[PDB]
């Protein structure tokens, strides 16, 4: 009961051209009749599961103003909450609840790796996380109750924060726009747009977050390169002339060090595998899980033939690249699965916006290596099969 995309009347071409990473946009009834597949009770229970990332924010009624409590929680933590002015946040709910993941199928005009997760929030009256900015692109989907959103169309270059809070709040915030969202309508914000959301009632908000890496975040992911090197080129100086000053790291040494790093980065096939892995890797303490035992190539062939369907558990953790020689590499949850040039055409299909049925898998369904690939992907918990 969801439309193809989340832009309602708007076309993807126009949205990406005029809004994406540029201007805020409010879309009224983008998702008609969309109510939360989960309930505030179920959200709380979900926040009590170990390995899950959840936070309770109390503007008032806590030990001190804007108190933050970190999960995983237990049911005793919820009963002591005031009747008003607090918020429950839960990360990666799309990875915990397939019905929420289906909401992610409404934003496919953006590449999978740009997606982070769907964060679900619940708040009674007056509940808010305060005025703040993110580096995220975000679709703020109203799923229950009403929320008053205030923003400012001018992005924040240098953010002036409030000292020592545990949550990032702006010291000064004057909004030039204000809206009250009902279940179904969506508010898109590009990065660094200051926004202040306040629940008018018992409300839930599904936040579809995108994220793109910066230089520090790429630099910190560089050690993963070593997986494909097994040493690589080593610095050498057989032509070393002796040492005027032994302390000096000469420009000639920096040249070779720069040459060694450039060789890593400039090898596109290498950079493609590295980035594909570190960008699909689970960002938090929640990875996928193997089901039952491996369904053999035979059962997989038959079960799929009898009308079974394959489901993508984590769309944001699925990607691929095509190489120059025609080979491809499929990335799933941080692992790299190499595809021969013949088998390479499956990568778009598996990571695509299509349904994975016997009909769509027909050509490769005979090939043994393809069945072996689906085995290992189901094994690692990247794909789940479901009968009709």
């Amino acid at each position: 009961q969801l439309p193809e995309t989340i832009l309602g009347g708007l076309a993807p071409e126009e949205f990406l051209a005029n809004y994406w990473q540029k201007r805020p946009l409010l879309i009224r009834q983008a998702l008609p009749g969309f109510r939360s597949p989960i309930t505030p009770e179920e959200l709380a229970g979900l926040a009590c599961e170990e390995g899950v990332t959840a936070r309770l924010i109390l503007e008032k009624g806590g030990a001190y103003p804007w108190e933050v409590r970190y999960g995983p929680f237990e049911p005793e933590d919820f009963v002591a909450l005031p009747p008003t002015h607090w918020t429950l946040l839960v990360q990666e709910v799309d990875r915990l609840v397939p019905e929420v993941a289906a909401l992610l199928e409404t934003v496919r005009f953006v590449p999978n790796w740009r997606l982070d997760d769907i964060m679900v929030s619940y708040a009674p009256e007056g509940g808010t996380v305060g005025a703040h900015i993110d580096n995220y692109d975000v679709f703020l989907v109203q799923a229950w109750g009403r929320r008053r959103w205030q923003i400012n169309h001018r992005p924040v270059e240098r953010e002036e924060l409030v000292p020592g809070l545990e949550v990032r709040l702006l010291a000064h915030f004057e909004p030039d726009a204000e809206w009250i969202l009902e279940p179904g309508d969506v508010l898109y914000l590009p990065p660094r747009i200051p926004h202040y959301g306040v629940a008018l009632e018992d409300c839930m908000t599904f936040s579809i977050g995108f994220r793109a890496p910066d230089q520090a975040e790429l630099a910190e992911a560089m050690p993963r390169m070593a997986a494909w090197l097994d040493g690589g080129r080593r610095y050498a100086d057989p032509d070393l002339t002796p040492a005027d000053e032994p302390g000096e790291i000469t420009p000639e040494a920096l040249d070779q060090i720069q040459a060694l790093l450039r060789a890593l980065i400039d090898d596109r096939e290498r950079l493609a595998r590295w980035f594909g892995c570190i960008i699909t890797e689970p960002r938090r303490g929640l990875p996928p899980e193997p089901p039952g035992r491996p369904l053999s190539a035979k059962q997989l062939h038959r079960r799929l033939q009898q009308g079974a369907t394959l489901r993508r558990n984590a769309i944001p953790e699925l990607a691929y690249v095509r190489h120059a020689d025609g080979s491809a590499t499929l990335f799933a949850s941080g692992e790299a699965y190499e595809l021969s040039p013949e088998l390479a055409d499956v990568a778009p299909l598996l990571t695509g916006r299509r349904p994975l049925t016997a009909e769509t898998l027909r050509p490769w369904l005979e090939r043994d290596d393809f069945l072996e690939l689906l085995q290992t992907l189901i094994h690692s918990g990247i794909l789940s099969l479901i009968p009709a």
């Binding site: 990332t53 936070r55 946040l89 990360q91 990666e92 997760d117 964060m119 996380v129 703040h132 993110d134 580096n135 995220y136 975000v138 924060l161 809070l165 545990e166 949550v167 990032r168 936040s207 977050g209 994220r211 960002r283 938090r284 303490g285």
Partner: peptide
Amino acid sequence: PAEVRMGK
């Protein structure tokens, strides 16, 4: 001072 939407 962790960013708000980033979570962990």
